[PDB]
């Protein structure tokens, strides 16, 4: 069937610049193209229909253009309230199909992460488990890598990682890493280390604690 291909999953820009999000159709769809905006945790919102007609209430900054197979949604003077997902849609033939979407990421200066390490709580140790958590807050760019070290040796099994989307206030990213062990295994080692490799530092940021001191 007809496939709407948005070549870019992510696009970088700054506040006040102009962005062009492209969308390519598998075959000729004329001008039967719509554009939508979707913010995290919110429903889609119609921006453009019939390739170039703005929906009621849509600001004049959003413009659509294109005919045949190539279409573009241009956002002049990017505001902070435009950090969202944008995708196209064709209604020339059934079934109706959407593009995979293109998320707008905001540019800013680099920032080193604030790293914090936490030992297991008494509530979990009473249950027989032992989880160690490492928070990595407010870094930029989003590219980062975290290693867990137990008594100096790297450990990969039992690790769970999670990343946030771009912060709506300072345009940074955050990540949490949880190393889950049993209480018996936790009591058989001393040092627990969370190592953060980021472009803002030639050497990794290291946070650790020793069980002998507690």
């Amino acid at each position: 069937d007809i496939v709407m291909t948005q070549s870019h999953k992510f696009m970088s820009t700054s506040v006040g610049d102009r962005v062009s999000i492209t969308c390519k159709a598998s075959q000729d769809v004329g001008t039967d193209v719509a554009w939508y905006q979707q913010k995290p945790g919110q429903s889609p919102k119609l921006l453009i229909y019939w390739a170039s007609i703005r929906h009621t209430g849509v600001p004049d900054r959003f413009t659509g253009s294109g005919s045949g197979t190539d279409f573009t949604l241009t956002i002049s003077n990017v505001q902070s309230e435009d950090l969202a997902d944008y995708f196209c849609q064709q209604y020339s033939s059934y079934p109706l199909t959407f593009g995979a979407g293109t998320k707008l990421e905001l540019e800013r200066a680099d920032a080193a992460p604030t790293v914090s390490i936490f030992p297991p709580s008494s509530e979990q140790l009473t249950s027989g488990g032992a989880s160690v958590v490492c928070f990595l807050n407010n870094f930029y760019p989003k590219d980062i890598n975290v290693k867990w070290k137990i008594d100096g040796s790297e450990r990969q099994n039992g690790v769970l990682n999670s990343w946030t989307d771009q912060d709506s206030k300072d345009s940074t990213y955050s990540m949490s890493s949880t190393l889950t062990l049993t209480k018996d295994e936790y009591e058989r080692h001393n040092s627990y280390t969370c190592e953060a490799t980021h472009k803002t530092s030639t050497s990794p940021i290291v946070k650790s604690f020793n069980r002998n001191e507690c």
Partner: protein
């Protein structure tokens, strides 16, 4: 004005059936095309079906993959749109959107509802375990472990503490989710004043408060 509210989501075992509902308001319901669209996790939106207005005989059009499986219909005397689904599989897990259509047969979606989330799995509902995370600016946190299914909401100090809060999305492993939340407060406000995280898991009627107390080591 225009308002759409979906209901019927939740956890359902594979091979089952259910009906989703969409309550509309703010516009003449029988005069507009209505449709259903699903959004799988990390996948593009997928149109399922739409039903025409009164002047077009209330006819329906279906995606070929769902014909014979999904059924769209309107209520006889109320502004409610339905979607019947049978033979549920794990691939049907998604957010299901109710939408009002424009453009005649050139269907586009001019207003979307909030959506309802459907999870198709055989895993058993499990309440969460909430563990505190304690060590000028100091960072605390809460660890939510071993629950199913999604979602879980987290607040700090019953909503009064919102600045500097990072709630990370849940991660699945061995049919159980794990979620964490962090908050950064000035050292002059803790532990001189209390800091408590609140965790809600409506699927198991769970609502836990966990006070963060300082540690000796």
């Amino acid at each position: 004005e225009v308002k759409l509210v979906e209901s019927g989501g939740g956890l359902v075992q594979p091979g089952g059936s259910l009906r989703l509902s969409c309550v509309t308001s703010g516009f003449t319901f029988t005069d507009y095309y209505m449709s259903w669209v699903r959004q799988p996790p990390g996948k593009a939106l997928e149109w399922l079906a739409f039903i025409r207005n009164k002047v077009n005989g209330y006819t329906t059009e279906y995606r070929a993959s769902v014909k014979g499986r999904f059924t769209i219909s309107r209520d006889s005397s109320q502004s409610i749109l339905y979607l019947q689904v049978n033979t549920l599989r794990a691939e049907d897990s998604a957010t299901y959107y109710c939408a009002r259509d424009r453009g005649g047969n050139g269907v586009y979606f001019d207003y979307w509802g909030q959506g309802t989330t459907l999870t198709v799995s055989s895993a058993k509902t499990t309440p969460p375990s909430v563990y505190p995370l304690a060590p000028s600016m100091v960072t605390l946190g809460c660890l939510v472990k071993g629950y199913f299914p999604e979602p879980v909401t987290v607040t700090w100090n019953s909503g009064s503490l919102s600045s500097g809060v990072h709630t990370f999305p849940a991660v699945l492993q061995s049919d159980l989710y794990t979620l964490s939340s962090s908050v950064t407060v000035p050292s002059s406000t803790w532990p001189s004043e209390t800091v408590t995280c609140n965790v809600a898991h409506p699927a198991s009627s769970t609502k836990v408060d966990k006070k963060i107390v300082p540690r000796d080591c």
